[PDB]
């Protein structure tokens, strides 16, 4: 799966003309009414969650992943909602994507990286990944809300992998 | 024994403090987590929970083992709900916790939540053990 | 996939305000109102399309005074929020709804049921109005005075969790002082009395109307000169004029009697409200009055509550009364915070218990 094609990462939300590619290529693998996936991808602002694009000059959306921070783990990130373009699939982009999240996230001061998966597991050992335990991602907040916030006793009553890795 | 109900209780990390109580005859804790608040119920903490007066506790508060508490919702005498929701209060900005009491055939149930934890969650999770031991005949 | 932003669905008497959480302001604001036929597409007809079309319509609303009457109307309401001005799939989405102040149990029972089996919402949550304005403003503990269109309540509040003993519910809001304006404006030579009139007189409410602070002077002002008159233009250019009327109108809120009512005013509820709570919490109720709802934006209404408190609480007391800016959507403001707060995970009422526990769950995780 040697890569050949010049690419960028770029958050949704420096090429917000891009947003709509960005929503097709998304639903296309998991279908869902596109009013919210507009929306999700809407959120994406430097101060997370943001959402990556994998894009090639001659622009072309080659992929996606979305990046959240972590309850109680400044050093981690979430990664969901991986995806690669169905057309263009088997070709190195989604290994260019993952690693060009660890690049992104570590420039950035994280260390640390988790994820979900099922059926997609091997893909994510093969890139380093290993089992770990869950975390909690933190959501979409707009910068405009607040932000402040003796008898005996009778007897008693009788799936996903998570994966992280460090950078 | 009574212990490995306040063990099932503690299970999942969500509450800081169990116990369950008599409070027919002479009350008395049966089983507590040591060293916490529930441990030190008194009967006259017992008799305010399950007494006549539903009222006063609005305006004067309860306590449980000293802790004062605020009452939110009084179900604790209601068939179908037997339950009374409540929140501690501290001073000084200390954080404040979510407590619910249930009340079976023979015991007090009270549960109080570690910090952050929501007061729907506490409350369900002392509803199902209640249920339990009424099914029990306790 | 990205695990998906909730809604956040607002339910008034007058009107719905619906959105994402997370975000600041709701994306749909659309009356609550089914309309049918006086004497076509539908049998029914409902939100914007109803307004569209008032003028061939009855209109109804299935919430009155905060609490749902109609259920089969309100399921219209809902089937609107989703499909046509969110144009969403509820399937996709939990879903944090909004209830009045002391809402019947079988009620939020209902409500639990038709998002689950109707909708098939994968979870759900239930909130007091007046809790959620109260985060708004940036606080957990204090007492909110939510007037609407339809209901007054005031709520007091500790840590995030009403205390209904202490609720006091007042059936006088904004389509009240409507009505009012309507006549008193007649008695000054106009004639407001249809329904299409009704909704004239009520933007003139929203416009020129406020509350004065101290009304016996200046209703001196108004008979003294005339630097309290306001004109207002009709939509077929017709001008009218408004004078004493413009405070007579909101002073009801003060003094229900106005409408007839053997009632105590907003000020002395919010007291009484105050008083029926824990010794230790008054100092801070006192000191954290939060206002909500589209009946608390007159000019005036803060001040006139501020000095209209003192005269009641001890001298010692100190007495602060807030007004937030967007108070007027507070509600829906209060239920995107809420609803995107990490903890608010741990709350939903998930597909899985209703299926274990029933309608009957909303009890033990909502309050
Ligand atoms: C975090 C989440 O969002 C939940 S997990 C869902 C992951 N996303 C999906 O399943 C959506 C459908 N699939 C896709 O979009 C793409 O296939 C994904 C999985 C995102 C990227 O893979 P592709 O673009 O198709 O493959 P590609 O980068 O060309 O291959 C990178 C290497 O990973 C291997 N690979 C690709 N798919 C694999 C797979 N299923 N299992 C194991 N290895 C896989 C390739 O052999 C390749 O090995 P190497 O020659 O570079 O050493
Ligand atoms: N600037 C304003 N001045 C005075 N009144 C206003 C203003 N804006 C809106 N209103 C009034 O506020 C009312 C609507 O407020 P809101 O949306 O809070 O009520 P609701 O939630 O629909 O009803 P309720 O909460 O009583 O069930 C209407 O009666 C409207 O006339
Ligand atoms: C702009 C606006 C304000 C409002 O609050 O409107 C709500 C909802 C409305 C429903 C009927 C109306 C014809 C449709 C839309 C008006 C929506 O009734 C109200 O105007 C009622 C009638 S008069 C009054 O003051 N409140 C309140
Ligand atoms: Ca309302």
Redesign the interface.
Known sequence: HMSLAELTLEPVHRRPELLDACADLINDQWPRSRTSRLHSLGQSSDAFPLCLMLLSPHPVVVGHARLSRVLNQPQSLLVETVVVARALRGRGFGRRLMEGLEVFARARGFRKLHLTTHDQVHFYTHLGYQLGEPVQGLVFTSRRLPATL??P?????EPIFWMEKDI | ??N??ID?LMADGTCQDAAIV?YKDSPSV?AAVPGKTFVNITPAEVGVLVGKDRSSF????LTLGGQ?C?????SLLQDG?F?M?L?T?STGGAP?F?VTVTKTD?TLVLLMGKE??????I??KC?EMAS??RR??? | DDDIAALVVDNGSGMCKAGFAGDDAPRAVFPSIVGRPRHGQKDSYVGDEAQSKRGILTLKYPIEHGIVTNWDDMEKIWHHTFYNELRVAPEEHPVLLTEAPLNPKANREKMTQIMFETFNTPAMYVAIQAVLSLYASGRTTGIVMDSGDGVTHTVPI??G??????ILRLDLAGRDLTDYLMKILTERGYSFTTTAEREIVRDIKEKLCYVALDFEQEMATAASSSSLEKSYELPDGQVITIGNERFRCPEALFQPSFLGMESCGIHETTFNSIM??????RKDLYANTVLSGGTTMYPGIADRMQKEITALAPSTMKIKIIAPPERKYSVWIGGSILASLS?FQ??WISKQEYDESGPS?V?????
């Open positions: 003796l008898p006793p009778p007897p008693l009553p | 024994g009574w490995a109900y099932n008599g049966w609005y305006v004067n508060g004062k605020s009452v939110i919702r009084d709900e339950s929701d929140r209060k404040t979510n023979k952050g934890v929501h007061g729907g969650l409350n369900k509803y339990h031991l029990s005949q306790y | 500790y840590e969790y009403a205390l209904p003993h202490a029926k709570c824990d010794v230790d919490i903890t741990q709350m769950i009890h033990r995780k909502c309050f």
